[PDB]
């Protein structure tokens, strides 16, 4: 890898600088280099990895949606414009799929070394998320298998989080939020999405009394995102 010659600590320092500069491609390359040093990631480092790739793939997904919408309109009384829209949508799609495939890092070897609930749930949620992004663009013979890979990753994360974390844990809440979105947007299961979001919200509500002021702010922030989705869906 191109980061093989840079110190782990220097990669982490530069990932933080890249975040401040809004250079998320650089940030992701730095964090990929840090992961490939082979050591486990701290909580802060896991967040740097997630922030970097979420921003990179977020831009790709936004562009894919714009191009897909144009492509769909061109396939209606529409005037033929040639293969260019499909070609360029395919180009963006392939790059997106490449980034999801890279986030490989989970399989080699972050997840197998993650033993604590906070690390293991974090990585399995990530695995669900990036299979979900692959599912968003999938149209072929593997679409069902991609969806099931997302589901399986989310389900293992959910099982661990329910056994090992309090209902207000922000990682547990963000996992439940995203698995609920998976049910709604990917799995054609709006009722499961709503049930999961509602039960997650209610159980967190009942546990807020145990929290410090700072933890209360952390948990209620994600609870509001659950409520926002429930408001949209009901």
């Amino acid at each position: 890898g191109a980061m093989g010659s840079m110190e782990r600590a220097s990669l982490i320092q530069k990932a933080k600088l890249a975040e401040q500069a809004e250079r998320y491609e650089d940030m992701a390359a730095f964090m990929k280099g840090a992961v490939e040093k082979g050591e486990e990631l701290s909580c802060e480092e896991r967040n740097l990895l997630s922030v970097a790739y979420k921003n990179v793939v977020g831009g790709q997904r936004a562009a894919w949606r714009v191009l897909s919408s144009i492509e769909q309109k061109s396939n209606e009384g529409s005037e033929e414009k040639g293969p260019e829209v499909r070609e360029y949508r395919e180009k963006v799609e392939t790059e997106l799929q490449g980034v999801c495939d890279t986030v490989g890092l989970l399989d080699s070897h972050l997840i197998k070394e993650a033993g604590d609930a906070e690390s293991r749930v974090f990585y399995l949620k990530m695995k669900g998320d990036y299979y979900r992004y692959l599912a968003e663009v999938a149209t072929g013979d593997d679409k069902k298998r991609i969806i099931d890979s997302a589901r399986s990753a989310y389900q293992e994360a959910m099982d661990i989080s329910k056994k090992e974390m309090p209902p207000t844990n922000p990682i547990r809440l963000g996992l439940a939020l995203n698995f609920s979105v998976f049910h709604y947007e990917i799995a054609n299961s709006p009722e499961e999405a709503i049930s999961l979001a509602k039960t997650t919200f209610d159980e967190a509500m009942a546990d807020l009394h145990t929290l410090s002021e700072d933890s209360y702010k952390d948990s209620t922030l994600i609870m509001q995102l659950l409520r926002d989705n429930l408001t949209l869906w009901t």
């Binding site: 939020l177 995203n178 979105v181 709604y184 947007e185 994600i222 995102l225 989705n229 949209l232």
Partner: peptide, 5 residues
């Protein structure tokens, strides 16, 4: 927009 951002 719906997922954790």
């Amino acid at each position: 927009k719906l997922s954790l951002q």
